[PDB]
Amino acid sequence: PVDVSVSIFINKIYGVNTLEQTYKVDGYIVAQWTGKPRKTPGDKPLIVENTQIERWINNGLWVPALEFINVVGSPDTGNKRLMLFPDGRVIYNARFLGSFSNDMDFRLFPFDRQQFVLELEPFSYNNQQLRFSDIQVYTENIDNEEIDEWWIRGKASTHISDIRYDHLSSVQPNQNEFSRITVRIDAVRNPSYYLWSFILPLGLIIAASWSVFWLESFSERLQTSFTLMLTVVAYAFYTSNILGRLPYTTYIDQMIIAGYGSIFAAILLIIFAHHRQANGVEDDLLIQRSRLAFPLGFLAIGCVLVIRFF
Amino acid sequence: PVDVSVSIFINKIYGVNTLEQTYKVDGYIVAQWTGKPRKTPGDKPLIVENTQIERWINNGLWVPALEFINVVGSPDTGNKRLMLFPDGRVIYNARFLGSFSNDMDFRLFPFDRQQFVLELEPFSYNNQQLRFSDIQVYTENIDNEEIDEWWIRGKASTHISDIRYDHLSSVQPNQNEFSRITVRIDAVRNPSYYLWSFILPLGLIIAASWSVFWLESFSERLQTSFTLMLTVVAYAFYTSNILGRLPYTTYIDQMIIAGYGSIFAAILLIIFAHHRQANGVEDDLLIQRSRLAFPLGFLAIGCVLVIRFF
Amino acid sequence: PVDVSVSIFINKIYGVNTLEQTYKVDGYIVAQWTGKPRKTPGDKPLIVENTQIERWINNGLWVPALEFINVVGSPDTGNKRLMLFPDGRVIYNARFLGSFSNDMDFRLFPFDRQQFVLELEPFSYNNQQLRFSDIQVYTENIDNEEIDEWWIRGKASTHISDIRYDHLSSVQPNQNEFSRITVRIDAVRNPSYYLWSFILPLGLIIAASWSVFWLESFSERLQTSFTLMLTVVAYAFYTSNILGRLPYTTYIDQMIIAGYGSIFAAILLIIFAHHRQANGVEDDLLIQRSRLAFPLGFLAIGCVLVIRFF
Amino acid sequence: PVDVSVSIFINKIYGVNTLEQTYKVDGYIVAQWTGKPRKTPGDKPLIVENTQIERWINNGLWVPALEFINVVGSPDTGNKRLMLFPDGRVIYNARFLGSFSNDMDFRLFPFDRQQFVLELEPFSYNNQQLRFSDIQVYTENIDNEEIDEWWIRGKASTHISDIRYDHLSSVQPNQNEFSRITVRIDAVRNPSYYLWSFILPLGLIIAASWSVFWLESFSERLQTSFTLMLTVVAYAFYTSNILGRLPYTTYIDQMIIAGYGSIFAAILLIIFAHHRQANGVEDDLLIQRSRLAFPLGFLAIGCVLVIRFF
Amino acid sequence: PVDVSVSIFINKIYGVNTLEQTYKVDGYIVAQWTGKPRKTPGDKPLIVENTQIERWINNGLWVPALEFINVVGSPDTGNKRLMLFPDGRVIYNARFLGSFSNDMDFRLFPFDRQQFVLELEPFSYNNQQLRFSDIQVYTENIDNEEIDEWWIRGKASTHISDIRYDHLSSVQPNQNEFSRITVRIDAVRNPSYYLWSFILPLGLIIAASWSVFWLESFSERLQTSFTLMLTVVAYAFYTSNILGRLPYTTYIDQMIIAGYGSIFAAILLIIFAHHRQANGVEDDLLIQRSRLAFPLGFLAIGCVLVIRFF
Ligand code: NA
Ligand code: NA
C-alpha cells in the first residue's frame, strides 16, 4: 500500500441550511505520496496546472481520485495542481467547493450544538493499495469567527478509520475495506436573535394574557383572551420554516404549546366562572384569586424546565 | 446475450419532495459481465479510473451504457471506475446521484406509506444482446433510519422484467424488448409532527367553537364563532404547500372541512335561535340543549371515520 | 432532399408550470434516413453509442442536428445512439428532456383545456436538403393517466409543415424554407381540487354574508359584514400565485369580484337603512325584505353566467 | 478592417423579471463576412455544423467571437453552424438564449414603458480589425403580440456605435475602440390586471372609509375606520414583491399613501369631534358636514394627479 | 519572480444579496507579463482566442492561472483571449462573472455603508515565482450610478499584499507566501425606500397608539391599543427577510421594540387606571395627564438615539 499524507485547509464555511441539514465548505486539499524518482527540468520541482494533468495521466502517472462521501450533489472543483519532485514524490493540490451533509439534532434549538463533518475516501483503492497516513487540518480563517448564527469553538478533530463495503465483496473477495478521513468542526449556535425576536414578543403576549384576568367585565376578558390565543396559535409554523418538519418539539415549540395551554385554560376558567353565575349577580372570589398564582405557575413550570432540561 | 450481474449500493436517500413526488438517491452501481481473456500488467486486475475509460472504448472495449428510467433531469455521475481481469471479466463501477420519481398516493396523508423506486435499463441493447442475471441491493446505511419524516421498513425488493417498446419496432422488427431492474424500498411516514403541530391547535380551536354555546349573550356567541370559523377557513391551503394540488381530500383536509361544517352549523343554529325570539324575551331550551350533543356528534363522526377508514 | 422518418416516444410529462406556461417532456426521438451502403462487422447492424458518434462524424458521416423550437433553455440530452445498417440506412436514437413552452388561455380556469406542443426542426438544412416524411408518436405511458391536475384525452396529433425564414434570405436567396414537425397532446384540467378547496369555503363565506341580514341589530349587521368583505378581499391574489398576472378575469376571479359587490352592496344597503332612521325609532320593511331576494339575485347571476359562459 | 454584416432573428421574449430588471431573449444570430476564395465539395456551399467548426479553427480559419454585453450569466448557446462559399465568404449562424439586462424606470408603474436592449460586440477585435457594416433585425414572431403583461409596439431600432475602452489602452496604445450593435425593442405594459385586481378592491376600501362618516355612534365610526386603515397599511409591500425595493413611489404606492392619509385624517377628525363633546351631549355639525367634501377632496387630488402626472 | 501587471475593468455590479452577504461582479481582467521574444505572423501581435490557448499551453507556453479568493461557487468565465507580442510580452485577457462575498455590518441598517471586495491570487505560484507589480482598476460604468438600493461613492481602492499559507509549509518549506490583490469599492445604501415604506406607516401606527389615550371609555382604549400592539408585533420578522437572522438589532428593529414597549406600557397604564377605580366612579387625572408626556418621552428617546448613535 502507498502512504498518502493529506492536508486540508478550510477557507470558509457558509450557507448552513438547517432545513436540509447541509452546509457549504470552501478550501484546498493537498495529498502527498511518494513514487519512483523522475527527471524534471533542472533540479527544481515541476508544477503541472489544470488541463495538463491529463497528459501525464495518459502518459502513465498514478494519480488517485479522492472523493468526498457526505456531499449532496457533486463538489465543484476549481483549479487543480500537480507537483512533481526529482526525489520522486507527487503532490496533488486542488480546490474544492461542495455542499456537505451531516445529521443534526434540534432538541435544544436556540442553544444548540452541532458539528460540520468532512468525510474523504478513495473511490477505487482499498487499504491494501492506498493508506492514509495522517491528516493535518489548518483551520485558522474560521478558527474563532461567527458564521451568520454559528460560533466555531475549539480546533478541528481528525480521525482515520477503515470502512468495509459489502457491495464490493463479490468483485473483491477478501479486500473490500477502504481507508477514510473524518474532519469534525464543532459549532455552537448564537441564541441572541431568537431572544430579542421571538421570545421577547411572545413573552409580552403571554404577559398580556396574564393581565386580562384583572378586567372587571366578561366580554373584555373573553374577546381579548381569544385574540391573544389565536395570535399564539398563529406562531405554530415558526420553527418549520427555520428547521424542518421535525418529529420532536424544541424549546420554542414547547413555549408555544405552553402558551396554547395557558390561554386556553384561562378561557375555560373565565367561561366556567361566568357559568357559575346562575342568577347573574353572584361573584366568585376563590376562582378569581388566581391572578397571581397562574403566572406564578407558568414561571414555576418554566424554571423547572430550564433547570431539568439544561 | 451477455449476462450482466448488477449490484446497487444505496448510500443515502434525501430530498423527498412530496410536492413534485421526487426524491434523491445517492450510491454506487456495480455491473459485472464476462468477455474474452486479456493480458494485464502482471497477474493482477487492472483498475481504469475516470477520463481513462474512453481510451479503452476507442480501442474497442464493449462497455454498455445503463440508464435510469424514472429520473427527472439527468443523474449527476461522479467518479467512475473500470476493472479488468486476466480471466476475462469486466466490472464497471460508478457513483450516481439523481432525482428519481415515483407515483405517490396521499389518501391517508399523516399515516401514509409510499415506496422509493429505482428503475435501471440498458439504453440500446435488447434482451437478445444484454440480459440482467440478478441484482443484489445492499441497503444498510438506510436500513432502519429516519429520513426527515420517513421511516425505512424492511429490506429492498428486487425484480427483473422485460419491457417491450413499440417505437423501436420499425428499426428492430421482432427484437424490441428490453430487460429491466426495479428496486423498491418501502417508506412509512412519521405522523408525530402533524400530531403536535396541526391537529393539536385545530382540535383546541374546534373545542373553543364547542364551548361558545355556553355563553349567555348572542353577540358573544356570534362574533367569536365567526372569528373561529374564519380561523379554520384560513387553514385551507395547508396541505397544498406540503403536498401538491391533489384532486382528493386527505385526513387533514377532511378534518378542516369538518371544522367548516361544525362552526357554520353552530352559526346557523344560533342565528335561527335568535330569529325564533319573536318578542325578544322567549328563550328556547331544546334547541340549546345541544351543548353536549354537538361535540358528541363530532366525536362520533370522528371515531366512525377512524374505524372505517383505517 | 433526404427523407427523414421520425418516431417520437413520450416517456412522461411532468412539471406543468402554468405561471410560466411551460412543461417538461421526457422521452426518446428516433430519426431514420437512408444513405450509401457500407460494410459492418459481420452482416449485423452496428450500434455506435454516445461519445463515439463524433469519431464517425469526423470520418465523414452525415448526421443532421434536429433541434426543438419551443423550448426554454436547452434540452438536456442523455444517452444517444447511432445504428448503421449494411443496406445503407442510418438511425439516430437519442433521449431528450427539455422544458417546452406553449401559449395557454385561462378564461375557464377551473374547467380549462390546453395542449402540450412539441416542435421539431432541422437547424441548418432546408426542405431542399432534408425532408420529414412522416412522424408516428407512441404515447402510451401517458395515454389515459392523470398528471397532477391534468387529464390526457385522445391520441397525439401530428402535422408536417414547411416554415419560411426571412433572416436566411440573404444567405440563401430562394431556398430558406424549413420542414417542421408539430406534435400536439390535448390536456383537460381536473377541477376537483378547486371545487373542494376554494369554491366550498368562499361559498360558505358568501352564505354567511347572506345570513347577516337576519340579525336584529345594526352593529352586528355591520362589523360582521365588514369582516366577511375584508376576508373576501384577502382572496384577491389567489389566482396570481397559480397562474400569472393575466390581464383577464377567470371564473374564480369573477366569483371573488361578485363577492366584493355582494357584500359591499349589503354594507351600503344596511348603512342606508340606518340613515333612513331619522328619529331612531322608524323601522323599514320593504328595504329589509330582500333577505331572500338578494341571495336569489346572486344565484340568478350565477346560473346565467354558468349557462351563457359554458 | 473586415466588414461583418449581422442579422439577428428574435424567436421569442420571455421571463421578464422586473424585480431584477432582466429578461430572456431567444433567437438566432447570423454573421457574414468575406475572406479568401476556397475549394468546396463540388460548386456548392459547405455546411459545417457544431463540434466540427473547431477542426476548421485548428486548421487556420478566422472565426471571430461575438459576445453579448448586457447579459447576466452567460448566454446558453445551442446548435451553431458555419457556412463556407466557394466565392470566399464565411457565414456564422448560431442560436443564443441568454438573460439580458436593462435599466428600467418605474415612475408610472401600471402604465409603464420600457424597452428590451440587446448589445453585441466583438471580444478581442477593435474597429481597425473588425467593423460592423449593418444589422437587419427580423422581429415578426413578437411583432404585435402580448408577452404576459407587455405589449410590443413598433419595429426594432438598430444602431451601430464605436465604444472606447480605457483598460485596453496600455495593451493597445492608440487602437482600443470597439464597434457595437444595439437593438432596442419598445414594450408597453398592460395595466388591466392591476385595474381589476388592486385598484378595484382598494377603491372600495377607501369608499367604505368614506361611508363610515354616516354612522351615528362613535365606536362604530372608530373601530371600523381603524380596521380599514390597518387593511390599507397591510398593502405596503405590494409593489416590492412585483418590482424591487425602489427609492421612489409609483402610482400604486402614492394611492396607498393617500389611503393612509385619508383614513388617518378621518380617525383624527372623529377623535377631535368626540373630544369637543365636553359635556357628552353637544353635537357638532360643521365639522361633520365633511361627509361629501372629504371624498370630493380625495377625488380632486386624484384628478389633479391624473392630469398633471400623465 | 515574474512581474505580472493586472488591469481589472468592472462592467457592472448587480445582485447584491444582503441575506447571504454576496454580490455579483461582471467585467474583464487583463494580466500582462514579459517572457522570451518570439516570432509572430508578420510584425504584428498575434491574438489567440478561446479554445485555442490550450494548443499553446500544450506546446509549452507559461500561462499562470489567477483565481478569485472570495467567491461563492466558481466564477463563470466567458470568452478569453491571449495576445502574443514579437518583443516577448504575453497578455491574458478574460471575462469573469462570479458571486463574490464580503462581511457586512448591519448596525445602522437604513443608513448603512459596506464595500464590495474583489480578491485575486495565483493558485500555484508564490511570490518567489510570480509577483503582482501594480493594479489599475477602471471603474467608470459604475462610478457614480445607483445599483438598486446602493450608491457607489469614490474611486476603487487597490492594495497588493503577500499572504502566507501554513498548509503549504510541508510541501514548500520556506516559500509558502502568495501575492494578493484586493480591490475595494465603497457603497452607501439609499434609505429612501424604508423611509416612505416602513417608517412612515409604523410612525402613524405609533401616533394612533398615542392618540388612543384621548378616548373617554375603557373598552375603546383597550381593544384598539391591543390591535395596534399586535399590528406592531406582526412586524417582527421584517428585517429577517431583507437581511439575515442577525444577532444584533438595527435602527428598524429598535424602533419596532420601542413600539412594543410603548403600546405595552400604555396597556399596563390603562389597566392600572381601571383597577384603581375601586368603586367604579372615581376618576384619576394625574395618571391620565400623560397624553402629552408619553409621546414627548417617545420623541425624547428617539432624538437621543439619533444624536448618540449617529
Ligand atoms: Na369588537
Ligand atoms: Na383580525
TrEMBL record, chains A, B, C, D, E:
Molecular function, one GO term: identical protein binding
Enumerate the UniProt keywords alphabetically: Cell inner membrane, Cell membrane, Ion channel, Ion transport, Ligand-gated ion channel, Membrane, Receptor, Signal, Transmembrane, Transmembrane helix, Transport
Record keyword Ribosomal protein present: no
- Membrane-protein topology: Multi-pass membrane protein
* Transmembrane regions listed in the UniProt entry: 193-214, 226-243, 255-272, 292-310
For this record, the Gene Ontology CC terms, alphabetical, are: plasma membrane
Q: Does the keyword Nucleus apply?
A: no
Enumerate the subcellular locations listed in this protein's record, separating them with semicolons.
Cell inner membrane
Domain named Neurotransmitter-gated ion-channel ligand-binding is located at 1-190
Q: Which family does it belong to?
A: Belongs to the ligand-gated ion channel (TC 1.A.9) family.
Q: What is this protein called?
A: Gamma-aminobutyric-acid receptor subunit beta-1
Q: Per the UniProt entry, what species is this protein from, by scientific name? A: Dickeya dadantii (strain 3937) (Erwinia chrysanthemi (strain 3937))
